[PDB]
């Protein structure tokens, strides 16, 4: 029966208004009743191996210049896969295993433009992402036993979550990649790059989790290029943060990311891209 007047802060993406003077509601309340993650569990992608039952086998293609399909010349057999961690992200595959010799591309149909072009790396391009705001986690009890973990006031300055990638290293790796595009699109052609066409946050931005929060990072900065070939600096990146996620077609759930108390910094390798192409 008794009620309170508690206060909390929310990110712009989570709320949406209805028009008193002004108001708001959570963007999930019209789609699905959500569940908060227990702040006890972790989301860390740990190396998981996939092993076969008895009387079964898994075949490992130990071929450097392997484009994924067809007869792999030298094959080995193994019971379990090497440690593959569930790093889930969009437009950027993170922390995986690089290619051995040359950046080799993989695609089902290079001719059919509607098929995504999975690109594997040979050097792990370094990415450092943070959110500088020192934050508050005020435990608002909405009883009984149920305990909402709200955000409280802000401690310190205000400046969004960003990502840093060395310009030079990326300006070199992009050349290394376009070098392998020309083996598909003619010995001498021009390969431009642009940002996403249009769609939801999960598609047009760098959806990923790091330390407990879900970044959606603009990808327009990196894709600035045009390829004509026959000191210290970084390319800073501007990310929005979300808590109420709807990940997956609509089958993850809607889940409230429990706010993290402190400064969240993570360093990651980028090991591949999920490209697309539009005579």
């Amino acid at each position, epitope marked *: 029966d008794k009620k309170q007047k508690v206060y909390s802060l929310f990110y712009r993406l989570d709320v949406v208004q209805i028009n008193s003077n002004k108001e708001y509601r959570l963007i999930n309340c019209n789609t699905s009743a959500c569940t908060q993650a227990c702040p006890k569990v972790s989301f860390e992608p740990i190396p998981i191996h996939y092993c076969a039952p008895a009387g079964f086998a898994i075949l490992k293609c130990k071929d450097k210049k392997f484009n994924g399909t067809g007869p792999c010349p030298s094959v080995s057999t193994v019971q379990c896969t090497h440690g593959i961690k569930p790093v889930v992200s969009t437009q950027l595959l993170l922390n995986g295993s690089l290619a051995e010799e040359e950046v080799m591309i993989r695609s089902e149909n290079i001719t059919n433009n509607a098929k995504n072009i999975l690109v594997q790396f040979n050097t792990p391009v370094q990415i450092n992402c943070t959110r500088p705001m020192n934050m508050t986690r005020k435990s608002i009890r909405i009883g009984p036993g149920q305990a909402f973990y709200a955000l409280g006031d802000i*401690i*310190g*300055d*205000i*400046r969004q979550a960003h990502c840093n990638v060395s310009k030079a290293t990326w300006n070199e790796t992009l050349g290394k990649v376009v070098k392998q595009l020309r083996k598909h699109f003619g010995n001498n052609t021009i390969i431009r790059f642009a940002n996403s066409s249009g769609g939801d946050l999960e598609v047009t931005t760098h959806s990923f989790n790091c330390g407990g929060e879900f970044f959606y990072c603009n990808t327009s900065g990196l894709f600035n290029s045009t390829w004509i070939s026959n000191s210290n600096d970084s390319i*800073t990146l501007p990310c929005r943060i979300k808590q109420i996620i709807n990940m997956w077609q609509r089958i993850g759930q809607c889940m409230y990311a429990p706010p993290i108390q402190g400064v969240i910094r993570c360093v990651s390798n980028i090991t591949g891209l999920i490209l697309t192409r539009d005579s």
Partner: antibody
Amino acid sequence: QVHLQESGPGLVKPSETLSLTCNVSGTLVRDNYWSWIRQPLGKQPEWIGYVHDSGDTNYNPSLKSRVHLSLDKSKNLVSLRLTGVTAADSAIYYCATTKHGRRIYGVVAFKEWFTYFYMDVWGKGTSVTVSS
Amino acid sequence: TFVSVAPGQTARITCGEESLGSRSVIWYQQRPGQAPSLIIYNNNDRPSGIPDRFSGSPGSTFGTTATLTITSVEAGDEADYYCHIWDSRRPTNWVFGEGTTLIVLS
């Protein structure tokens, strides 16, 4: 060297145009940014506003509607106009050279930074009283 | 407000509301009957003519207040002290920080 010399009526009736001037020396009016600061008797100084050639000039929000600034390059003087004076406006009006600065708490990328000001060299001031 | 310090000791002076962001606070020493003289900017960067006695709080701290540290107080330092606060979180202040009178004793 450097020197400042305010001047003006030293008294104006209510609801009139107080006009004050600041004689400049030791440099040009085009070079430095200027600022004015009135100080009521026994109270804390209320900063008026800052003026520079090329239109870099902003005013106090508490008195934004009533104030006016200018610089006479030929005469080499810091002008000042204020309209509708009242009892709350009687004070010692100083004249101060002002210097800009940049405080950067971030990556600078944003626009995440702020211009803080500091008036290093002052003037003696002029006692502007207000009574009928 | 008045601060009474024994001679040759260290005085401290408190100015303004609590910090909200990383700040840049100016410190002014107005002597009785004279004009304010600029003492410290950048929260600890003193210009020409000011000894390294006077100190302050670096504007990197949040939640704490603006502090002025007068080391080895001398008779001349008897004055009123103001300060201009530049918080990254609060709008530009045009009302200078309220005074604090230093009183060397005996």
